Amino acid sequence: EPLPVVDLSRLDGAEEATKLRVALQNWGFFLLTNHGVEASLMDSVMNLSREFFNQPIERKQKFSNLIDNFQIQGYGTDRTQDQILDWSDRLHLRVEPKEEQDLAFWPDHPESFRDVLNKYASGTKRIRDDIIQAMAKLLELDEDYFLDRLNEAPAFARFNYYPPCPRPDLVFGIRPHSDGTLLTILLVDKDVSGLQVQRDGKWSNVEATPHTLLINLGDTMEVMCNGIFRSPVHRVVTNAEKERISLAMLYSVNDEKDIEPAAGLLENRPARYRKVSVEEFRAGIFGRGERYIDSLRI
Ligand SMILES: [Fe+3]
Structure with missing residues (x-):
């Protein structure tokens, strides 16, 4: 069976919106076409990224995450837990809110990297709003x-x-x-x-x-x-x-x-999950064998 394709152009109207439902139900992932992000911008995200990662380790480590929260920012695969078996290099950047950006972690080379990310992040934010x-x-x-x-x-x-x-x-x-x-x-x-x-x-x-x-x-x-x-x-x-x-x-x-589950979804439909603080939600998803939100089933 093929991966479900969802056309953002047509996401109003039952035909494509129902395709989204059957994809959320059967696969959980879906492929989004006609999403309004120009192909050459996607290419630049990928190509400038490849360029950043193919640098000598010293250049990349100038943006390495600092060590003294949960969502670490910068270059590395730490989570005293470097994730060697990920077999991967990573760069984690807080993009929103734009006020809370810390450019000390954003690569200065390639020169366009920051502008291309911010440009691509405006497109995915709009996609997020449409999807949601x-x-x-x-x-x-x-x-x-x-x-x-x-x-x-x-x-x-x-x-x-x-x-x-x-x-x-x-x-x-x-x-x-x-x-x-x-x-x-x-x-x-x-x-x-x-x-x-x-x-x-x-x-x-x-x-x-x-x-x-x-x-x-x-x-x-x-x-x-x-x-x-x-x-x-x-x-x-x-x-x-x-x-x-x-x-x-x-x-x-x-x-x-x-x-907490949306109240507007709760008498023949009881709540499947307990309510908890966003602060306790973060700690639990970062906090292992068993899956965190299972511990919320009730
Ligand atoms: Fe994932």
Whole structure:
């Protein structure tokens, strides 16, 4: 079976909005086409990123994360826990709110890197709003339910470089996990991403065609939608033949309210998840064998 394709051009109107529902229900991931981000900007994100990661280690470490919160920023794969078996180099940048940016962690070379990221992040923010408004409608909440919870909310840019692994094995790479976000927007450089999603025990490949985006909702959305849609467990395996690049835009909600299923979804529909503080939600998704939001089922 093929990866579901969702056309942002047509996301109003039952035909394409229902395609989104059957993709959220069956795959958890979907491929987004006609999303309004120009192809040459996506190319630049990928190419300038590759250029940043192919530098000598000394240049990259000038942006290395500092050590004295949970969401570490800068260059490295630390989480006294460097993640050697990820087989990956990483750059993590807080992009939103724009006020809270810290340019000491943004690469100054290639010269365009900052401007290209900020340009691409304006496009994915708009995609986030469109996707999330469609979902509110699917949930038969009103258009702007989440938009209000998305004000001054954190958004991170996670850049991944995966050099080839001569000895691929499942102990290497990104291990099975669900995202903690409200929404995740992923940009990959090639038609081999290594990204896989577990559906009813089975792992399926998630591949992007040229210049499309891979979207999934995270655990924040699953609690808020009372599990009507589920945050998918996924992993990124290693590759012996090619190098790979990706950028994930990681969209969370703000500190204001608490994380609980939407009241408008609760008498024949009891709440599947307990309410908890955004501060306790963060600590639990960063905080392991068992999956955090399971401990919220009740
Ligand atoms: Fe993930």
